[PDB]
Amino acid sequence: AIFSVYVVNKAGGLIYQLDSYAPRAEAEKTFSYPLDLLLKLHDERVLVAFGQRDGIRVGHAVLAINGMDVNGRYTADGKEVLEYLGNPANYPVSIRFGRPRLTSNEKLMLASMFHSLFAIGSSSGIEMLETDTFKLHCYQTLTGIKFVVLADPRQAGIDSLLRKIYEIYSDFALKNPFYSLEMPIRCELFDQNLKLALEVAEK
Amino acid sequence: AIFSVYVVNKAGGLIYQLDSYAPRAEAEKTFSYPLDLLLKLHDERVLVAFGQRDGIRVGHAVLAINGMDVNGRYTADGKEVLEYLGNPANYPVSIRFGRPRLTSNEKLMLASMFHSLFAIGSGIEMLETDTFKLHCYQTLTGIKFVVLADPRQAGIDSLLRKIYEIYSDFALKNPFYSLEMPIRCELFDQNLKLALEVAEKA
Amino acid sequence: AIFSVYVVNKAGGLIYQLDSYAPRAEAEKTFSYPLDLLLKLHDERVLVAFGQRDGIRVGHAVLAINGMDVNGRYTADGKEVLEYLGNPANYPVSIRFGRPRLTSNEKLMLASMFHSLFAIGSSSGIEMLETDTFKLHCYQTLTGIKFVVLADPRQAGIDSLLRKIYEIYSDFALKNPFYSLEMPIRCELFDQNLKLALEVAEK
Amino acid sequence: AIFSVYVVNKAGGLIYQLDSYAPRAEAEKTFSYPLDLLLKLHDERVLVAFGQRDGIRVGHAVLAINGMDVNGRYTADGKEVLEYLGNPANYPVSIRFGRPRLTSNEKLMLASMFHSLFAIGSGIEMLETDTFKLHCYQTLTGIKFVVLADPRQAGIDSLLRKIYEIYSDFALKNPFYSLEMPIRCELFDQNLKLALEVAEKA
Amino acid sequence: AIFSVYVVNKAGGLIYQLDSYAPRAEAEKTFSYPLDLLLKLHDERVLVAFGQRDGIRVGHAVLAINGMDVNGRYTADGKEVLEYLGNPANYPVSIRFGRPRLTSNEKLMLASMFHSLFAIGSGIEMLETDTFKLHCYQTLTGIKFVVLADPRQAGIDSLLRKIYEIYSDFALKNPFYSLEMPIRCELFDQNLKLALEVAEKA
Amino acid sequence: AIFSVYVVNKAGGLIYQLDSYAPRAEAEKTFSYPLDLLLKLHDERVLVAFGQRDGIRVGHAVLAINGMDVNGRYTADGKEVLEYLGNPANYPVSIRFGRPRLTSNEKLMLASMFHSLFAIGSSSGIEMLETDTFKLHCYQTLTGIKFVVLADPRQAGIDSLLRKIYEIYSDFALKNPFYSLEMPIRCELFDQNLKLALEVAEK
């Protein structure tokens, strides 16, 4: 599977992002409160700050409660989650935690580790970081544009996909003279052509 | 050759396009290896580096292998071009050569010229490089008809005047048409295709 | 014919300019005032702002009146032109308009459309803009210097000319160690060598 | 192939290294000149540019000349590689080919990735390029075991788990050892060398 | 070889020059095609890429074609070098090779060193590259005699001492001569030319 | 002999310096005062400002007095040198002058004359300045790092040495992920590997 696609301009500005796979959860689990975990709101998301209870790591996010899917730091009831799990009344609860989606800042931070050395215009232009849970591919073009793709470790075709996104990008620029390279990409035909290129690459 | 015909609106956004980026083969010669032509990988294109023999030219790309379509650096089957030509089992082979498919960098380079023209803009105007020539006809109303071609293609002038006529016919028949919206019109598509055929025969 | 030659440094500074052809006029025409054209002073030049009378476009400049050649925004009589053509007394007049010479800002603006993308040091280095009335050739060197030449559409040799100017430029730099690359070129032998290179290219 | 095994401390400083940058020859073919292989100088390395004949590959470097070790661009004797192959007196010669020795730029490129990983860092993690793959195992205590290899080398995973075991044995026996100080320990050196041998046979 | 002799005034402006940028041919070999030498266009110079045969060297440029002078990438007649060597009608041809004419980039590179020397400056001093060596003798009065040469040219030291003697003779005989003005003096030109001849024979 | 080795980062920051040969003196000479030379303190060093007495040029530094080696602008007695040679009591003196070692600013200034033109990432990367008394070699890498070596005019091997320092540098960076390229190099194994590379190059 392919989790995410994003594009960074030569000045480190995020210019396009598409989260493909998003419901990367696990399972709803019951917990007898007082909760043996310490939670923090980080960038509109409720993360596990401390405690490694059976199954749960620090860095895990809360994704749902009892059915009420977590709308970031709010419940589906509109109520605030940190006061809700600190709420004595609803002590026996079911909570869904999984590895959260990357913030835009995180996407940038991750992108900044590739091609940091060689000047703009230095045989494939692809650098990568691989873990247990994902593989990140970063293609830098001649003029410093970075195309990044996040996918499970053993996903084939990413090299060709990245070149194709560039092909879609450069064609978009040529057909749309209003567009300047620092600008966010906001074009229907781009979205269409990318989603298709992803479909091809998935198979 | 003509690589693309497209229509850009006053605000600089695409409203109609017709692409023909896939080239036609220029040269076809049968080879009896040791291969009297030297090849190198260049951005996933197999280019001729040396040995401009009668027909082929230093800079042409390997388009087809004995008739079959090859994409990137691998054959129709799926073996690497270079790792299949110095082959003891396989040696006698015919190859098609010509201008490579249009690249991203090239597209980006032209985009960068065209965008600049659009912004500095204050008749037919043409942007040219060694390998490309972009022709732009702008109407009073700010509609731009663009033809992307190689430096030598003739009769674009007349092609552009035709697209103008066809667009005018479309605009007269569809006066209350959102200019930010793409042109969805069979007859338009039809007549533009026919107009391109004429220019391609020229 | 070749209309103009100029050189831009890697930082977008105009470093040399020579207007070759200059009397690009048309013919003196009589006009019964009140004048059916709206005129504006733009960058020391009297341009046609509005009105497209028989022969005259907007953007056309005033180049002479009755014989008194227009010294920019003044007449040969020292009198101001906008008050002179608004002057009731001299209502029946003869005026010469043609496409004005490029301002230095215009030269720069035009130069900024070429090689804007690829970084300094990215097979000929020549990019061009062609119209009915002129063709503009822009050569970018390894170190970002732009040599620009303005000439009628079907003028041959410009590619070779541009390389020669570079040859003259680089030799000038080598013989003149005081010279630094951001500086305006002010050298007699340069002017001599260029005017000669133009002469060769014209033929 | 495995190019380097090293141990980095929590603060990011080197505390142990074992280098094996000198490659083993991949291909060996005897040539009867006119030489059916084209060579170019590239940062004081003689690389094969064209003619991927059965065995050798476009990109391999000339490692040895008829058995003897050649350094940079000069022979074991001291004559220039290129100025000795088109030789009327000397023509029949055997040559060894394979991956060139690791370059500075390459090292610097990986360093730039590794440093960035170290700084952004907030399991085994791997950094990869076309020609390199760096494997990094970080302990709870922040000790990093790093193996530098080509993209295809297998069994680094197990090698890294072994170095972890050997380092753990060392740390248990030497609990009050300055972590800023290099590891000076024969048995450590011994066991790591043996562990690398296993991974190299794999 | 000596490419240029010139005199720079205290303020860093040119006051006298004598150029000899056009090279002499180093090697001349008759060829019987298929041509046993591979050529590439490089900034409008035809350079030898591969095949350093007895005489010629990888990096030399094609200077002349069967005796006649060729400029840029076209022959004395006006046909393209490459598009005339793989010719079925034309094959047997002799070619002259050697150091290419001095380029703009090279000139600019040296200029950038020389200018820097001039500005940082606070005896004979020499600036050197792989292919160039610039020799600069500065007088008490700040007059600079400069000789541009390749790294191996000998006896520039003595040539520079001679130009100093000749300039001194000129300055003694013309004491009230504007140092911002170019040197217009037949005898000066004469004696410097003779001095260069001696250094060129050396 | 090799006098000095230093390394400059791509932003013109001095990142490592090692003065190899240092006691580059001449001989102690007697002078009957009032001293016929004018001396100035420049950057913690006592230089000859004016006067060219038999043997001594302007630019020569004072390196010792009567045995008391000059600790920059102080004597081995702790006393200030400019007041000491202007001191009437000790008028008959012996003074040692020779060409001073390069200040860090001088090292930078000298380095700034090489590779100033071509952009970062433009066949050996070595540029040099040669005089009677020294030859300076400057190697610029792909990413703008300058390695500089100062040595007597006819010293062989410098090209290979410079490449080796780069090899040592790049390896140091790879083994030390804390290190960032703008930082001063402060590592024992680096010093060891360099001093060895110098030893090889000397022979």
Q: Please identify which residue in the block is written with the tokens 């951005």.
A: B43
Residue B194 DSSP symbol = H
Residue D114 and residue D140: Cα distance in Å, rounded?
A: 19
Residue D84 DSSP symbol = G
Torsion angle (degrees, nearest 10) of CA D40, D42, D47, D51: -50
Contacts (Cβ under 8 Å, ≥6 apart) of F199: none
Phi-psi region of C111 (alpha: psi -120 to 50; beta: other; left: phi over 0): alpha
Using DSSP bridges, classify how beta strands E61-65 and E68-69 pair: parallel, antiparallel or unpaired: antiparallel
Residue B105 and residue B102: Cα distance in Å, rounded?
A: 9
Planar angle of CA E120, E126, E128, nearest 5 degrees: 100
Q: Are the C-beta atoms of A21 and A100 separated by less than 8 Å?
A: no
Q: Are the C-beta atoms of E108 and C173 separated by less than 8 Å?
A: yes
Residue C68 and residue C58: Cα distance in Å, rounded?
A: 22
Q: Are the C-beta atoms of F55 and F48 separated by less than 8 Å?
A: no
Residue D41 and residue D73: Cα distance in Å, rounded?
A: 8
Across the strands, what pairs with B134? B127, B148
Residue B114 and residue B134: Cα distance in Å, rounded?
A: 8
Q: Are the C-beta atoms of A85 and A96 separated by less than 8 Å?
A: no
E4 by DSSP, 3-state: which? strand
Element (H, E) at D92: strand D92-98
Peptide bond into B23 cis (omega under 30): no
Identity of the amino acid at C28: E
- Please state the three-class secondary structure of chain F as a single string: CEEEEEEECCCCCEEEEEECCCCCCCCEEEEECCCCCEEEEECCEEEEEECCCCCCCCCCEEEEECCEECECCECCCCCEHHHHCCCCCCCEEEEEEECCCCCHHHHHHHHCCCCCCCCCCCCCCEEEEECCCCEEEEEECCCCCEEEEEECCCCCCHHHHHHHHHHHHHHHHHHCCCCCCCCCCCCHHHHHHHHHHHHHHHC
Q: Name the nearest CA neighbour of C40 among C19, C58, C22.
A: C58
Q: Are the C-beta atoms of E60 and E97 separated by less than 8 Å?
A: yes
For chains B and A, having 3+ Cβ pairs within 8 Å is answered: yes
Q: Name the nearest CA neighbour of A167 among A120, A134, A129, A200.
A: A200
CA distances for E105 relative to C168, C173, E39, E121, angstroms = 12, 11, 21, 24
Peptide bond into B34 cis (omega under 30): yes
Q: Are the C-beta atoms of C111 and C128 separated by less than 8 Å?
A: no
CB contact under 8 A, B126 and C123: no
Element (H, E) at B172: helix B156-173
Residue B61 and residue B47: Cα distance in Å, rounded?
A: 4
Element (H, E) at E163: helix E156-173
Element (H, E) at E165: helix E156-173
Residue E127 and residue A172: Cα distance in Å, rounded?
A: 49
D59 by DSSP, 3-state: which? coil
CB contact under 8 A, B54 and E86: yes
Residue A12 and residue E97: Cα distance in Å, rounded?
A: 49
Task: Give chain C as a DSSP string.
Answer: -EEEEEEE-TTS-EEEEEE--------EEEEESSPSSEEEEETTEEEEEE---TTPPTTPEEEEETTEE-BTTB-TTS-BHHHHSS-STT-EEEEEEEPPPPPHHHHHHHHTTSS-SS-TT----EEEEE-SS-EEEEEE-TTS-EEEEEE-TT---HHHHHHHHHHHHHHHHHH-TT--TTSPP--HHHHHHHHHHHHHHH-
CB contact under 8 A, D82 and E52: yes
Chain E environment of D38 (Cβ under 8 Å): 38, 50-51
Six-digit token string for F176 = 């030390």
Print burial letters for A113-128: b (CB count within 10 Å at least 16), e (below 16): bbbebbbbbbeebbbb
Side-chain-side CA neighbours of B89 within 13 Å: the count stands at: 2
Six-digit token string for C3 = 């209309």
Task: Give C168-185 as a DSSP string.
Answer: HHHHHHHH-TT--TTSPP
Q: Please identify which residue in the block is written with the tokens 């040099």.
A: F128
CB contact under 8 A, C113 and B117: yes
Residue E23 DSSP symbol = P
Residue B116 and residue B104: Cα distance in Å, rounded?
A: 18
Contacts (Cβ under 8 Å, ≥6 apart) of A87: none
CB contact under 8 A, F121 and A118: yes
Residue D63 and residue D65: Cα distance in Å, rounded?
A: 7
* Residue spans of alpha helices (H) in chain D: 104-120, 156-173, 186-201
* Residue spans of alpha helices (H) in D36-103: none
Q: Are the C-beta atoms of B25 and B96 separated by less than 8 Å?
A: yes
Six-digit token string for F131 = 């005089």
Side-chain-side CA neighbours of B96 within 13 Å: the count stands at: 14
Q: Please identify which residue in the block is written with the tokens 């869904």.
A: A96
Contacts (Cβ under 8 Å, ≥6 apart) of F26: F55, F96, F97, F98
CB contact under 8 A, E117 and F117: no
CA distances for F109 relative to A130, E120, E121, F104, angstroms = 44, 7, 10, 9
Of D32, D38, D40, D52, which to mutate for an interface test with B (greatest number of B Cβ within 10 Å)? D52
Q: Name the nearest CA neighbour of E42 among E19, E18, E59.
A: E59
Residue C27 and residue A91: Cα distance in Å, rounded?
A: 94
Six-digit token string for E105 = 């980039």
Residue B197 DSSP symbol = H
Angle of helix F188-202 versus helix F158-175 axis, rounded to 10: 160
Torsion angle (degrees, nearest 10) of CA F96, F99, F101, F106: 140
Residue E14 DSSP symbol = E
Chain E environment of F110 (Cβ under 8 Å): 120
Indicate if the alpha-carbon torsion angle A128, A129, A132, A133 is positive or negative.
Answer: negative
Q: Are the C-beta atoms of A162 and A156 separated by less than 8 Å?
A: no
Measured in whole angstroms, the distance separating CA C182 from the mean position of its chain's CA atoms is: 21
Residue B190 and residue A180: Cα distance in Å, rounded?
A: 32
B133 by DSSP, 3-state: which? strand
Six-digit token string for F160 = 């290979």
3-state DSSP: chain E helix, strand, coil percent, rounded to 5?
25, 30, 45
Residue D149 and residue D132: Cα distance in Å, rounded?
A: 6
- Measured between CA atoms, how close is F124 to chain A, in angstroms? 16
Side-chain-side CA neighbours of C105 within 13 Å: the count stands at: 4
Q: Are the C-beta atoms of F125 and F143 separated by less than 8 Å?
A: no
Reported resolution in A?
A: 2.8
- Please state the three-class secondary structure of B178-192 as a single string: CCCCCCCCHHHHHHH
B10 by DSSP, 3-state: which? coil
Q: What are phi and psi of F82, to 5 degrees?
A: -70, -30
Residue A41 and residue B47: Cα distance in Å, rounded?
A: 55
Q: Are the C-beta atoms of C111 and C99 separated by less than 8 Å?
A: no
Report the 10 Å Cβ neighbour count for F49. 13
Q: Name the nearest CA neighbour of D111 among F170, F183, F147, F15.
A: F170
D81 by DSSP, 3-state: which? coil
Residue B105 and residue C128: Cα distance in Å, rounded?
A: 18
Chain D environment of E52 (Cβ under 8 Å): 82-83, 85-86
Q: What are phi and psi of B72, to 5 degrees?
A: 70, -110
Identity of the amino acid at C177: P
Measured in whole angstroms, the distance separating CA F4 from the mean position of its chain's CA atoms is: 6
Residue F9 and residue F145: Cα distance in Å, rounded?
A: 5
Contacts (Cβ under 8 Å, ≥6 apart) of C102: C4, C110, C150
Length of chain D: 202
Angle of helix B104-120 versus helix A158-175 axis, rounded to 10: 20
CA distances for F80 relative to E80, F41, F65, F71, F73, angstroms = 76, 11, 12, 10, 6
- Candidate from D113, D120, D123 with C-beta closest to A127: D113
Domain ranges of chain C: 1-21+102-203, 22-101
- Measured between CA atoms, how close is D122 to chain A, in angstroms? 10
Residue D202 and residue B53: Cα distance in Å, rounded?
A: 49
> By what technique were these coordinates determined?
X-ray
E186 by DSSP, 3-state: which? helix
Chain F environment of D106 (Cβ under 8 Å): 170
Residue B50 DSSP symbol = E
E153 by DSSP, 3-state: which? coil
For chains E and B, having 3+ Cβ pairs within 8 Å is answered: yes
Residue A152 and residue F42: Cα distance in Å, rounded?
A: 64
Report the 10 Å Cβ neighbour count for A195. 12
CB-count burial class (<10 Å; 0-12, 13-18, 19+) for F139: buried
Q: What are phi and psi of A86, to 5 degrees?
A: -90, -10
CA distances for D5 relative to B48, D2, D75, E22, F169, angstroms = 42, 8, 30, 55, 18
Q: Name the nearest CA neighbour of A6 among A125, A169, A156.
A: A169
Contacts (Cβ under 8 Å, ≥6 apart) of E97: E25, E26, E27, E28, E29, E48, E55, E56, E57, E60, E61, E62, E63
Q: Are the C-beta atoms of D127 and A128 separated by less than 8 Å?
A: yes
Report the 10 Å Cβ neighbour count for D19. 13
Chain B residue with CA closest to D52: the answer is B86
Identity of the amino acid at C114: F
Residue D137 and residue D158: Cα distance in Å, rounded?
A: 11
Chain E residue with CA closest to F113: the answer is E116
Six-digit token string for D31 = 């040539």
Q: Are the C-beta atoms of D39 and D49 separated by less than 8 Å?
A: yes
- Candidate from B108, B116, B128 with C-beta closest to C130: B128
Six-digit token string for A74 = 């709010």
CB contact under 8 A, F122 and C144: no
CA distances for F78 relative to E123, F29, F69, F71, F74, angstroms = 38, 22, 11, 8, 6
Q: Are the C-beta atoms of F75 and F81 separated by less than 8 Å?
A: yes
Chain B residue with CA closest to C134: the answer is B125
Chain D environment of E36 (Cβ under 8 Å): 34
Side-chain-side CA neighbours of A130 within 13 Å: the count stands at: 17
Quickly name the fold that domain B1-22+102-202 has: Beta-Lactamase (3.30.450)
Six-digit token string for F141 = 């890498």
Q: Which residues of C touch E (CB under 8 A)?
A: 123, 141-143, 160, 163, 166-167, 169-171, 173-181, 187, 189
Residue E176 and residue C87: Cα distance in Å, rounded?
A: 60
Chain D residue with CA closest to F179: the answer is D115
B57 by DSSP, 3-state: which? coil
Across the strands, what pairs with E24? none
- Please state the three-class secondary structure of chain A as a single string: CEEEEEEECCCCCEEEEEECCCCCCCCEEEEECCCCCEEEEECCEEEEEECCCCCCCCCCEEEEECCEECECCECCCCCEHHHHCCCCCCCEEEEEEECCCCCHHHHHHHHCCCCCCCCCCCCCCEEEEECCCCEEEEEECCCCCEEEEEECCCCCCHHHHHHHHHHHHHHHHHHCCCCCCCCCCCCHHHHHHHHHHHHHHHC
Quickly name the fold that domain A1-21+102-203 has: Beta-Lactamase (3.30.450)
Measured in whole angstroms, the distance separating CA B112 from the mean position of its chain's CA atoms is: 17
Across the strands, what pairs with B70? none
For chains F and B, having 3+ Cβ pairs within 8 Å is answered: no
Q: Are the C-beta atoms of A106 and A19 separated by less than 8 Å?
A: no
Residue A140 and residue A146: Cα distance in Å, rounded?
A: 5
Peptide bond into A34 cis (omega under 30): yes
Length of chain B: 202
- Candidate from A123, A171, A177 with C-beta closest to B107: A171
